[PDB]
Write a protein that binds this ligand. Sequence first.
Ligand SMILES: [Zn+2]
Ligand SMILES: [Zn+2]
Lengths: 463, 98, 370, 549
Amino acid sequence: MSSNEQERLLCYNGEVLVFQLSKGNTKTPILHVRRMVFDRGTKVFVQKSTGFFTIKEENSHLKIMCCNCVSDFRTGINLPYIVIEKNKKNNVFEYFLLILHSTNKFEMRLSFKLGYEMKDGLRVLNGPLILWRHVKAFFFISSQTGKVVSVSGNFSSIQWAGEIENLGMVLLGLKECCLSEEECTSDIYIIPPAYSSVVTYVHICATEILRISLIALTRKNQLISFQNGTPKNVCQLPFGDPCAVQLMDSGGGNLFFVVSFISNNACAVWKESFQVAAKWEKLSLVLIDDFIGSGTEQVLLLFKDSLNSDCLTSFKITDLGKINYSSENRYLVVPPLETGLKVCFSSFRELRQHLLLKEKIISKSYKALINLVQSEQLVEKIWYRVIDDSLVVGVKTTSSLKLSLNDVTLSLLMDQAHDSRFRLLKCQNRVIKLSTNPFKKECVQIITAVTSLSPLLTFSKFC
Amino acid sequence: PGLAPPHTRAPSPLGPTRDPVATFLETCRELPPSVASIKVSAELLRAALKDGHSGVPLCCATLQWLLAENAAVDVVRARALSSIQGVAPDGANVHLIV
Amino acid sequence: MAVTEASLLRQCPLLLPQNRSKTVYEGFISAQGRDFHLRIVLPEDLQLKNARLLCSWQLRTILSGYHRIVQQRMQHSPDLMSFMMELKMLLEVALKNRQELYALPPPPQFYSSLIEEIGTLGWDKLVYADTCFSTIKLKAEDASGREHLITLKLKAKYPAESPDYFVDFPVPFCASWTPQSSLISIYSQFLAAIESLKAFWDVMDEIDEKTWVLEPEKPPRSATARRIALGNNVSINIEVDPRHPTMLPECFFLGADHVVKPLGIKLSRNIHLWDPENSVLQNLKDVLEIDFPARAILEKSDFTMDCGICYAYQLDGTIPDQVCDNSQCGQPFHQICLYEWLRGLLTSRQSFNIIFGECPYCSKPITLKM
Amino acid sequence: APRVRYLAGFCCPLGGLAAGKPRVLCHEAEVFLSTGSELVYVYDQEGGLLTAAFRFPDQVWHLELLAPRRLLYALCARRGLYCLSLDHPSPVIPVDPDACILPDAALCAFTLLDSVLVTLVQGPARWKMQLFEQPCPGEDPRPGGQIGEVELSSYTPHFLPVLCSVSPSGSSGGFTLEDALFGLLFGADATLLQSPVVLCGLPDGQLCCVILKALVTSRSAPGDPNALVKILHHLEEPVIFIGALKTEPQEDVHCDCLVAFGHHGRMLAIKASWDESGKLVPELREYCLPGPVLCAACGGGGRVYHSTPSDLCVVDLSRQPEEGPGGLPPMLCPASLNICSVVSTKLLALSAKGRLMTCSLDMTTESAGQKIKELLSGIGNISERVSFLKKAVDQRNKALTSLNEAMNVSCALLSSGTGPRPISCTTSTTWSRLQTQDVLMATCVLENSSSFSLDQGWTLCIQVLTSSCALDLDSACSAITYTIPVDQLGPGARREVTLPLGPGENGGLDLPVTVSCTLFYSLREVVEQEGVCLPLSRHTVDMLQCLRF
Ligand SMILES: [Zn+2]
Ligand SMILES: [Zn+2]
């Protein structure tokens, strides 16, 4: 929430911060930090420490704006940020970025001082870096510089933001376009512009060279993978108006996308199998961190403030496996049950190894198949052209291959994954010899196939 | 094909489950047997079939007359069959009785 | 099929000939719904007399204590097909033998339903469960207030098949098991057997109280025999018919030929005066025309000072002389019996005229000097 | 109570940090830390608040410490080796180039023995070991004169290489072995001289040791690598972590065992046997752990605390000598690369996300029911997933079965058993009529005689080849190919396909015409360039099939 007596939550370092603004009376409202942690004995959150920051000017409309961890560029340490608005009723809004230390003490970095209020896609970024928009006007204020700046480019959306390898700071707003945040403007191997109409939130996960492997989620309640913009492994999401994804780990490989919806409801989906593993409702909030101290991520679910005028009553902490906590002797079954739990887990973690082993054998045996039936590249390469209702595929040869001694052809072979039926496929073959700059000397022999198209475009597509 | 002279393994055609345009449409964007019968006078059928080809009077001769213009009538003339299961052009099956 | 072209596909679906000359096969062999890694290199010909067969560590730990079997099967067996048959069956056998380690129950039925049914009973009833959940053993009470126990061994599918019910009391317990029946069904059958056999128990409880039961010591519930001591250095053993307990037993007396005669004669004469409306005590007292001693010796009840192999005193002059160097056994033997016995065992070794080897009853070091 | 705590985390990149590089060291309650970046951090272990924060230039690759002296060495990458007195009168500190010593600049890697310093420096093809004096008195912290140099002649170049200090018994930030072993590995020289020995793991995965006593040279006296440096065991992959363990524990431990790690996880451990020839012989194991191994420490009693990108896992070598396998348990922590192990086990690490954490390993009336509830919800949570994995296993199996049938037919096909049993293709010459003109048609009949069902993934490719002799002038149509799915064919079973070959344009049929039939297997459909085509028959149509009376 965002008000003078209203709070916001966050996760820091396997614990939970509560920033609450509180009218103190003498003076103006104070920011109070609680830094909480999970007891596991008493199965509650116990206040470990507090903190205060006294604000000076006797103007109403103080407001928490967003909150997360960030990493200061000076030290390189993950730190809570927080953003305060100050509004005087002057049509002037200050926009403090204040940072908190190990010591539960505060530290100004930006005053920043606009006349007009900030709204939409506020997203704080590494070198504690505020970035916003109004009417298709993107602005940012680095902590380094200390100046308002404008983004030169003209975009609709700023869907993702963050630092990458070699580049330093970047935005994806239009799925071609691929900025910096100093020298404004590879946009080569991103997702298709087909999706660009439906994508509302991206989340990268990894970057190689440029090749990004990356997720979506759409207005259609879809969820989707991409590896070099090859849309693999879609789902369907139960709920409507998806906001965002985080990632969660659960141990070995057990990686879930903890999707939140504007409808105050949320999923987990289980990577390995793009499948809704669980769905919950009303979820005032969600956080991904180790609140136990096991050594693997969990999720915290918060339920509504109808229950109490108090925050972390009505929680539900969970791995989504072995761990689950919430708010006539019987015992002799316990050691058996724990022992089942751990032996079900042994079965999981074995099979996963089992499954990899099967994959491996299959591959091994094809390659065996290929040396079974059987070095020099006898072909240059493949290329293909669309004429009218004619498919023309071709190939450049090499000097090795002697068309004097060798009758050759070329077929086309359709994927039955697409073609549920037997349509027959006919292809006409031409041999084309051209002399290259005749006025030894290079001849170019090219071989090329021809067929119809409309029969193949039955599934909007074919391979 | 089931009745046919050769009794050889001919593959089932199964006329396409969808139109190309229809499959195209669905991709871009994401029960009893029907019966008819008639009755007709045996006197009518006798008088119309006399010029009497041969054979058992009615039902068989009726079917022979009905399919005199289909190629697969001489084989039914031989085996004197008053009920058969043909297919169609569109791959639907039809049993027709007399 | 006949030929090992298609029969081998059918009977080993997951063994893939890697090489064209079908010499290297690799992948999976099935056994008890579980697939095992195996790479079986032949020579350039199809002779298992000499072959390589390598295993995963999973497989070798499971075929511990048959290594020789498999090595011999390789050299003796004609074909691969038959060899795989023998291997498959052998794995089958090895896992059902080591059934302790290998369970994957289907939990959503099992561990949930078991808890529901145990809730349906009420939480005094269970006494024990193994951690593998395999064993349970329960209690039920008589109207008398006697505790009676039952072992059940549960399978992968409890509700599908019968749970094996293993129980004390002396006549066979029989259980109408349906898949629709549950723990409370077999529990009801068990309370039915309790209420039925009460008379037999009442009789044996009366005996253990009033008399010097000698041979079974804190007797179990399966016991139909009671070696009663009466006077001194003479005993009577009595075995009872369970369904008509009150009726006469096969009775007889052990001890001195001069002491035993009069009682036997008197039994002969006074047996028509047995009546099944009184108790066994109230009938024995009027038939044998005596009262019994109520533990004439309770502490030194008996120590069978007899061989503990042939269970007799006086074997061809020899007496129970050789004992155990143990407080908990103390069991005498004969030289002859204990030599004859230890001469068999793998553990015992023979010094000059000395044999060290394990006491039969307690398996502790015992020494015999001939 | 909580077996793990949070200290701090950091600026991470995406995913998190790479390996080889970042380093953490624990002194007493003093703690040392790089993130493989331009920053070196020191944390008071009581309250995980910072003491001291050192900006270098250029990505710190390594830290070591000499505790007596109260000194922390760092290697900056393109610069040389700095030195820092730990007292050292925002909490950020930039270094002064005051502190730089041997700006050798191409030095990658470096250790420390007592008051000796060893570096292993980059050049052209030959990397070289250099070896300096390090002044024992409390002075201006100097190099002195370089005693020694070699060139690691066998080495001809993301991954650093690595150096280990290994002392023999009696004689330090390193690893004291026992005499049995030391004598076994290094020889009588190193034994007699009680010489400490320096073990180099390099990116090739050659794993080399040099005796320090035999490494003194001069400009008259040039260190001969062939003979002076030596080569234990070639892990075929790069090296990550060398170490040494107390097996059989029954601060200066007389360690018994030697541990290497490859990157992909061919772990390599060594011990003495003294067996079977009445002779000391070396005990070699290459295990294969998981994965990529990303970093590795050693703890109390033969326990190697490692990481994969999956999880933080362990092997025990405390138990013929050593063991058959390392089958290895997590403690269910993520990929921490940069792991360290103190012994008192209480270990320290850098979570691949960005984090410093400190892993310190080791009835009720209707709160027992909440236990039962929780446990069953858990087994419920998991059974789900076990079921998925089951069905997946199903799919893989069905693939192998189909695969198997394919390979069996293929082998049958490639054999010359003197009848084409498994599958046949007969082709045959028809006249028909169209419109006006009599046409020449080829009925091509595929028959399955054998048991084997040619299922999905399979396809006939037909090719209709003209007259031969490629001419002066190249025609319009060299050939036609038709390609067809064969779906679920079955045994006894049969396709018939009709082709025209006959005069389409210009009343032109040239003979002989051959029609060739072939089969492909498709790997992908059922699930560097990859499939197989297989030849069936190849029928020549000649005039005598095309004459009509
Ligand atoms: Zn005896
Ligand atoms: Zn004994």
